[PDB]
Symmetry: D2
Subunit: 262 residues, 4 copies
């Protein structure tokens, strides 16, 4: 396989049963890592993901947990160490979103998205960094961001804020813990071909509208994001910390400016 330094590494992935999380689970399995799959409530997909990792070459467990609940996050990292012996890579991938006019967005709805998308990643990063520091492990944190840590998002002010927050969180933790060999990085996916988007992307006109926002002209495959994750987690990225690596087919480069407009 590709990244040999990843063989037998313990990798925890929140929301790891579907979409980007699953594709990362499987790719780390292809690298013969030991994967810990978190999931909110869909056991069967988690079980399916578990089997894919094993069938690709990895060991795997599944663990139920809500990332808005501190004990579930604490429990997740502890379960990983109990079961597999250690922790090497922490991937905070859970996320929720819904469109609402911003002046109409409720406080409860703002909070749900903030708690899940930002606070969940803080909790996960914290619990991982704690463990690395306590045990002198030069570990690795990958936080799942979005093109929307840079691209503003009308109707999704909670989501955009959550990721803008995630960016400074990541950069801060990277600076703070860089002298301990602990690396912390964001991945910024563009529009990706996942479960949440299956409905939209079936419609030919909505698919084309989305593709028109992508300079490379196609919706990303989750494996292309997983490729970035493997790289970042590996010792090939040894001198890379506190960055956001956008995997968006050019979306942050301002798609409305194609062909020299404006």
């Amino acid at each position: 396989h590709m990244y040999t330094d990843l063989k037998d590494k313990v990798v925890v992935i929140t929301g790891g049963s579907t979409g980007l999380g699953r594709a990362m689970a499987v790719r780390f399995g292809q690298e013969e890592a030991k994967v810990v799959i978190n999931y909110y409530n869909n056991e069967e997909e988690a079980l399916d993901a578990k089997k894919e990792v094993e069938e690709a070459g990895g060991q795997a467990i599944i663990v139920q947990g809500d990332v808005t609940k501190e004990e579930d996050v604490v429990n997740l990292v502890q379960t990983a160490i109990k079961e597999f012996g250690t922790l090497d890579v922490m991937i905070n991938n859970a996320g929720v979103e819904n469109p609402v006019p911003s002046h109409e967005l409720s406080l409860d709805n703002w909070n749900k998205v903030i708690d899940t998308n930002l606070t969940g990643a803080f909790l996960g990063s914290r619990e991982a960094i704690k463990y690395f520091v306590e045990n002198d492990i030069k570990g690795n944190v990958i936080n799942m961001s979005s093109v929307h840590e840079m691209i503003p998002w009308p109707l999704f002010v909670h989501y955009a804020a959550s990721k803008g927050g995630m960016k400074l969180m990541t950069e801060t933790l990277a600076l703070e813990y860089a002298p301990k060999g602990i690396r912390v990085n964001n991945i910024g996916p563009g529009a990706m071909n996942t479960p949440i988007n299956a409905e939209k992307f079936a419609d030919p006109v909505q698919r084309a509208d989305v593709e028109s926002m992508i300079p490379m002209g196609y919706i990303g495959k989750p494996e292309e994001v997983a490729a970035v994750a493997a790289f970042l987690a590996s010792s090939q990225a040894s001198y890379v910390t506190g960055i956001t690596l956008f995997a968006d087919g050019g979306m942050t480069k301002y798609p409305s400016f194609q062909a020299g407009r404006g």
Copy 2:
């Protein structure tokens, strides 16, 4: 009298009793505006500020409120509309922070800073914009941010995250409500001579170390920030929206690289 277009505008300012909030209250008083001073804790400070505002040429009331409470923020804008007739400028300035190694930061302490610094500004911004939309007013929002929406801040991951989130919140709302002529901007102060820092700046070795990180060589005066607020609220800044305007004596330009070291 600088910005004549500000005379008799209604300006709400959270945390307006001390520091930068007070400096801004006074300045909008100098422009003969109608200032609503929100405060949480110390009525005697708010009363003392209400006074400077009246002396400077303006009108003023004081309103008690906790920015982490939705009813309090809703009440504040409604009080401003009752008392002065309308709303023109909403300034979300309330902020808290404390040093903790990140791997030791509690969820409650993380939440308090996020709730106060980011969510308070979201509720502030929402309630103002809601009023602007419904009443066809080309209003204005100033969100008080920090060099730390760009500069990472070890021991202050909660603070950094809250301002990175504030940046994307501001940018989203600016984009979402630009077609209505409603403008939304951030101010990014560096090290400023305010109450919060009075401890730090008394210690002459600490004052010097802070000063060694400001290229311009001095700690910022609170009125230098209020000058930026006056500009941004004014019709002089009519084409300016979605920005962060740093008032930092060069701090975002990387202190460690002065004279060339690298």
Copy 3:
């Protein structure tokens, strides 16, 4: 009379005979400053502008010069010092551009845009700062940039490169000369109603397409930019250095994401 501290300051402006340069010349005239108008080509335009400046309440001369020629830039600052006594504000505003597919752009055409847009501003900035250092003056430099120091611009790779370079040039000089109290900032205009665009904006389908990329919904008026220049040169912006201040009706906030598309 807005910025009283500007009265009788010496302000040099390259490309000051038309467009944004002219709007800025007039504005500093309204502030009763002493404006030196550089021009390359059309004396009758420069003379016509010299006039608006004198009518607006200020003093003015006109100086012919090509900003790609070192002797011309050196001459211009020396002429300003001869004629008015000193220098206070240096504004590097000269700019050229033309659409070419990037793989078809000639070296000479690349060089002309770089020489004019970036190097001219370097020479401008150098000669002004040189004068500020030697004579202990807390002077000011405004470099005229573009949304395209941040927005990439296919068919205009030379232009985009020149402004990305201008951003780092400005930031470096701001940091290097901050301890001397010399401030250096950029302005970043979006689509502005100027001579260069008069062609484009006559075509009603073109005017509309450009307008559809401005969140605020209108093409910028040149005086909206001069208002930013007046602010930045003034002592109101005393703590503001090393920044880019975008005056773009929201254009850097990603036009394609209005109403939520993505």
Copy 4:
């Protein structure tokens, strides 16, 4: 080896005989690519680099050329196609630098650095993109930037401007050519252990001063940059375009802010 899709790819590297360029030559050799080594005047190192690529598993040629000369750049890409049959990856790595107070920097010296660091990369990128477009190859451009496309650099205003320019150049070409499957990216190295730095890094106090600017606490090894180059060139980075990937041990995260200062 690691990236199998890189086997037999034609990779052109400017300044490829020493430092970062050499380390990239060798690493692509380890991937069994065919490497074209450009060099300015040091044949023996070029010859040595050539042999290292072959000894690692690759084919290699060397070609003399000054990147400030258009015909040498044109010649380089043509020589690559003649010799090896095609062109897949273009790496623009040439660079020069020297410290000068910015108000004292000569026009000739500014130009030398601009012509070499920015214009050279434009010429190389152009010649490569031309070839990809003419032949429907989904090719790859890597432009060698620096932490100084983001970090300002007193005494090196020409260098900083050159890389700020490079950033918008890269982003622009990425947007322009993304619909042709052509990817364009920057690598942003921090302080690296190369020939140009051997003198400085021998001195224990200068080595420590530099290491104090690096959060990870060590000077990067050229192979760590070469690892980023292999990743970016490979189809593992298939959805990654127009980015700058900093490999700097945390240097862009503001080293003066370690331990919660300011």
